[PDB]
């Protein structure tokens, strides 16, 4: 029985129920994430920005089944084209807008990675991606509005690959958390 999360804490409790087992009902997780109405007071603790690039702020470790984090994107901040390390990845906008550009997996031959499509994710919308679907880049293209997004990855992962748009070549990157449970972790 999927009920509307009343608060971020309620959403976290519901997610612990949806990940109690070994598999993931993607549509139900996406539905509950989308149904939570962003309330800035509830996540202010995690909204720690950096002037130079987006930050990753861990909110919950999902009893080992998933990492729930909040990403804070300053104006013009964006990610690399990347994969998701054989994990499910849900992205819900809490504030602002983000541009998501989708790319297919490159072939072994060096070549320009041409985008398949792009879309604007708006406040409260939840997107989903996994390696079977493809790769993506996420960017806050706004010149005046910082963006904040809520991400859930299952299983949790600490590394992924960044892809060079000019060649398709990839390199392993290790993800680092700017804060954990509201505490800056330098
Ligand atoms: Fe991603």
Swiss-Prot record:
Coiled-coil residue windows: none
Keyword Repressor included in the entry's annotation: no
Keyword Ion transport part of the UniProt annotation: no
Known cofactor(s): Fe cation; Ni(2+); Zn(2+)
GO biological process: cysteine metabolic process; L-cysteine catabolic process; L-cysteine metabolic process; lactation; response to amino acid; response to azide; response to cAMP; response to ethanol
Top EC class of this enzyme: oxidoreductase
This enzyme's EC code(s): 1.13.11.20
UniProt-listed Pfam families: CDO_I
Keywords carried by this UniProt record: Dioxygenase, Iron, Metal-binding, Oxidoreductase, Thioether bond
SUPFAM superfamilies with a match to the protein in the record: RmlC-like cupins
Stated induction or repression of this protein's expression: By increase of sulfur amino acid intake.
GO cellular component, one term: cytosol
InterPro entries reported for this sequence: CDO_1, RmlC-like_jellyroll, RmlC_Cupin_sf
Residues binding Fe cation, per UniProt: 82, 84, 136
Annotated cofactor note: Binds 1 Fe cation per subunit. Ni(2+) and Zn(2+) can be used to a lesser extent.
PTM comment: The thioether cross-link between Cys-89 and Tyr-153 plays a structural role through stabilizing the Fe(2+) ion, and prevents the production of highly damaging free hydroxyl radicals by holding the oxygen radical via hydroxyl hydrogen.
Pathway linked to the protein: Organosulfur biosynthesis; taurine biosynthesis; hypotaurine from L-cysteine: step 1/2
Domain of life: Eukaryota
Family: Belongs to the cysteine dioxygenase family.
Record's function text: Catalyzes the oxidation of cysteine to cysteine sulfinic acid with addition of molecular dioxygen.
Self-association state and partner proteins as the record states: Monomer.
Protein name: Cysteine dioxygenase type 1
Species name: Rattus norvegicus (Rat)
Lineage: Eukaryota, Metazoa, Chordata, Craniata, Vertebrata
